[PDB]
Amino acid sequence: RCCHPQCGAAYSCRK
Numbered sequence: 639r640c641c642h643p644q645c646g647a648a649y650s651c652r653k
Contacts, residue, residue, distance in 0.1 A: 641651035 639650045641649050
């Protein structure tokens, strides 16, 4: 998962 600010819009909090 990547729900951090390092991924931004391209995060993976859930979907």
